[PDB]
Amino acid sequence: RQWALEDFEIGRPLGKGKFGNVYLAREKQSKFILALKVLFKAQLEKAGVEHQLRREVEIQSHLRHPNILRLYGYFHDATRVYLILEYAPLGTVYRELQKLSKFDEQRTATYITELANALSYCHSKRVIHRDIKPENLLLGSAGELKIADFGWSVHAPSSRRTTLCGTLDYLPPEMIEGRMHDEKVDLWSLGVLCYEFLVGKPPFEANTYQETYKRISRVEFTFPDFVTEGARDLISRLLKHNPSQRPMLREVLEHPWITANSSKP
Ligand SMILES: Nc1ncnc2c1ncn2[C@@H]1O[C@H](COP(=O)(O)OP(=O)(O)OP(=O)(O)O)[C@@H](O)[C@H]1O
Ligand SMILES: [Mg+2]
Ligand SMILES: [Mg+2]
């Protein structure tokens, strides 16, 4: 809506991404606190990711859900593109997990409910996120989960690939194999997260790319003894090689382990 860098006072860095250098900022006239995600045009051009940036802006700017981070607008200058985002004051789920090591069943079930609700809203518009990982799950002022980083988002179904040499840990077999995929991709990532929240590490983690790939394609994971029967049941339903066999989000939200442990309403 006609914004420029001179309209803001920039503050401390909130985080770093591959391309996204994110800062706290304040709009000079209103004093409103927000985050500016800064991207270097030369790096976007070298990598050939301009189409992903267009989808990030066009998809995220139209979503309105309390568990989805708002994108208010954007602007650019000679060397950088600036995305104007809602500021998430309590940081990332990634950092919460590094601090706590693992989450209890109540916190896990509450975060899974919030995801589920955000994804149910996305999927109602045929939007699939495809990059649900803890560094992209931000926390609002009341500690509520907010899905962010819509760079890999697309309208379903899709055959487009995600990263090339980056983390495979949250991706399903159909995406790592380059096959056509849909909304069921986010259901698989939900199962990976549920496991990582309870155990402290994702289920297919390995020292190499090929071994992680092998474990994902064969769905090779085991549970430590402390994981309860209800959590094992939900995780096992979500991590099914066949996407058509993965549950609907309403079945996740009504699962007896979720309703028994989540904080509501
Ligand atoms: N609105 C925000 N409030 C607080 N922290 C944020 C916000 N946006 C991003 N961050 C932090 O900055 C880092 C970069 O976020 P983001 O995922 O948008 O960058 P990116 O991964 O490079 O994006 P993309 O995956 O589209 O290239 C994240 O680790 C996140 O913790
Ligand atoms: Mg990110
Ligand atoms: Mg991006």
Secondary structure (DSSP) of 51-77: HHHHHHHHHHTT---TTB--EEEEEE-
Hey, is 113 helix, strand or coil? helix
Domain count, the chain: 2
Q: Are 71 and 84 in contact (CB under 8 A)?
A: yes
Q: For residue 123, give Cα distances in angstroms to 149, 185, 211, 244, 247.
A: 16, 11, 31, 15, 13
Are 219 and 253 found together in one domain?
A: yes
- C-alpha separations of 46 from 50, 54, 82 in Å: 10, 16, 18
Pick from 44, 71, 91: which residue ends a domain?
A: 91
Please list the alpha-helical segments (H only) found in 14-151. 41-47, 50-60, 93-100, 105-124
What does the alpha-carbon distance between residue 126 and residue 44 come to, in Å, rounded to a whole number? 26
Distances (CA, A) of 140 to 70, 159, 215, 258: 11, 33, 34, 21
47 and 162 housed in the same domain: no
- Identify the residue whose C-alpha is closest to ligand 1 atom 4: 88
- 18 in a known ligand binding site: yes
Nearest-atom number in ligand 1 for the CA of 56 is 26
What is the residue range of 29's domain? Answer: 3-91
The Cα–Cα gap between 233 and 167 comes to: 26
Residue 222 is encoded by which pair of tokens? 């085991």
Q: How close are the terminal C-alpha atoms of the chain, in Å?
A: 36
User: Is 135 annotated as a binding-site member?
Assistant: yes
**Which of 259, 162, 178 has its CA nearest to residue 217?**
178
Contact 112, 194 (CB under 8 A): yes
Structure tokens at 163: 């990263």
Q: What is the distance between the alpha carbons of residues 204 and 55, in angstroms, rounded to a whole number?
A: 29
Count of C-beta atoms within a 10 Å radius of residue 241:
14
CA–CA–CA angle 165, 134, 206 (5° rounding): 45
Residue carrying the six token digits 């155990």: 199
Please tell me whether residues 117 and 139 are part of one structural domain: yes
Residues 130 and 252 in one domain: yes
> Is the domain of 76 the same as that of 134?
no
Residues 21 and 37 sit within 8 Å (Cβ to Cβ): yes
Q: Please give the radius of gyration of the chain, using alpha carbons only, rounded to the nearest integer.
A: 19
114 CA distance to ligand 3 middle (Å): 23
Give the atom of ligand 1 at the shortest distance from the alpha carbon of 86: 1
Residue 238 and residue 197 in contact, taking contact as beta carbons nearer than 8 Å: no
| Resolution to one decimal, Å | 2.0
